[PDB]
Each structure stands twice: as structure tokens, then as C-alpha cells.
């Protein structure tokens, strides 16, 4: 089997940049090299086949080049709609095999997270559980740290974090953090705080509520 390697698994580039994504085959594949784009929502389309042939309906901002073992996908000028993962694939010898993908991030100006904290719903409490949720929305760059503090002490067990893909329209990221406690645990404490560290603020960005209020 032939192994396809995209040595860069992610890149960050600015709107208007000419962007190059590279692919190396473990042996000469004689120009039988195809490129795919997968959007964050999972949609896949063929961009380029046989090294350099633009597939019908695809924007001409995409092009492909190469020969032997080394191939490249070029984006002539990066646009907002290009947030996606790009995969190479050899069609020289069975089994057909794919590279591991290169995710393209749009480098935008910094954006501070909007932080929101939510106490457990009365419904969940009545059932014996207590999830506290903290949304950190529309920030850039993706680098962010979130701490939960309960009566001022950090809590790490019972935390579930999730991140959106880069937003197709504004190029920001968002994050959700959920701290799940038992009702009994939740009721032993007063102050619940979700504290984010991001480059847009020299101090932590804090949202909090007190059970006694």
C-alpha cells in the first residue's frame, strides 16, 4: 500500500494569501493524485484530479501541481469560504489511499470571548444532578484556558469541554465548558465561577454566580 503524507496538518493564513498545501507519496505515483475539500459540516468535494485537472463547478482559485512523489494544492487567493480540511489521495495502485489532511485556519484580528455562566436548571436539580455551564463565544485566536472555581478552589473532575470549528462567516471560535456535580455536591458550595485566560485581556475574564442569590 502507498502511504500519503501531508507533513503540515494545519496551517493558518490571511485572507488574500496564495496558500500552498503539500502532499508526499511513499513512492512515485505518476500524477495519479487527487485533492478533496471537507468543510466543517462534513461536506466533501473533489477539487482536483490527475494532479492538475480542476473538477467541474469548483472555483478556479484552486489549482494543483506536481509529479513523481511530490504534489501541491494551491489556493490563488484565500477567501472566507475556504475554511476546511484538504486531503490528497493517490489513484495509482490499490488500495486507494488518502493523506491525513491539512486543516486551513483563517488568521483574523484578535477577538475577545463573550463569557456566559448558567446555573443548573431547576428541572435537573429536582432529578438529583447539577450541571453548571459556561459559554465562551466568538474569540480569536483559538488558544484559551478555562478554570472552574467553587468557593474559590479549582475543580477539574466532572468537566466536559467542546469547541466549535472556526466560524464560516466571522472566523472566530467558541467553546462550551460543563461542570457536572451531584445535587448534594452542588449544595455544599456557594460561589461558582468560570474564569478564562485569553490574549485579549491581561487579567482573567470572570463570570460567576452565588447560590445564595
Amino acid at each position: 500500500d502507498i502511504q500519503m503524507t501531508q507533513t503540515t496538518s494545519s496551517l493558518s493564513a490571511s485572507l488574500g494569501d496564495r496558500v500552498t498545501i503539500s502532499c508526499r507519496a511513499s513512492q512515485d505515483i505518476s500524477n495519479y493524485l487527487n485533492w478533496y475539500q471537507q468543510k466543517p459540516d462534513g461536506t466533501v468535494k473533489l477539487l482536483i484530479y490527475y494532479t492538475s485537472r480542476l473538477h467541474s463547478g469548483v472555483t478556479s482559485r484552486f489549482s494543483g501541481s506536481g509529479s513523481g512523489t511530490d504534489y501541491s494544492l494551491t489556493i490563488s487567493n484565500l477567501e472566507q469560504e475556504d475554511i476546511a480540511t484538504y486531503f490528497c489521495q493517490q489513484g495509482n495502485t490499490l488500495p486507494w489511499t488518502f493523506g491525513g489532511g491539512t486543516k486551513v485556519e483563517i488568521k483574523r484580528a484578535d477577538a475577545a470571548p463573550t463569557v456566559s455562566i448558567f446555573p443548573p436548571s431547576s428541572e435537573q436539580l429536582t432529578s438529583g444532578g447539577a450541571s453548571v455551564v459556561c459559554f465562551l463565544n466568538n474569540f480569536y485566536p483559538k488558544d484559551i484556558n478555562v478554570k472552574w472555581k467553587i468557593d474559590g478552589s479549582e475543580r477539574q473532575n466532572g468537566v466536559l469541554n467542546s469547541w466549535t470549528d472556526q466560524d464560516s462567516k466571522d472566523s472566530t471560535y467558541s467553546m462550551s465548558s460543563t461542570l457536572t456535580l451531584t445535587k448534594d455536591e452542588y449544595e455544599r458550595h456557594n460561589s461558582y465561577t468560570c474564569e478564562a485566560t485569553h490574549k485579549t485581556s491581561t487579567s482573567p475574564i470572570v463570570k460567576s454566580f452565588n447560590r445564595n442569590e
Binding site: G42, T43, K45, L46, H55, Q89
Partner: peptide
């Protein structure tokens, strides 16, 4: 067709 020329939503 050429490559995997068209794909469904999965």
C-alpha cells in the same frame, strides 16, 4: 470519475 468525483452527505 477522475477521482471520487461526487460524494453524498454521509
Amino acid at each position: 470519475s477522475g477521482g471520487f468525483a461526487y460524494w453524498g452527505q454521509g
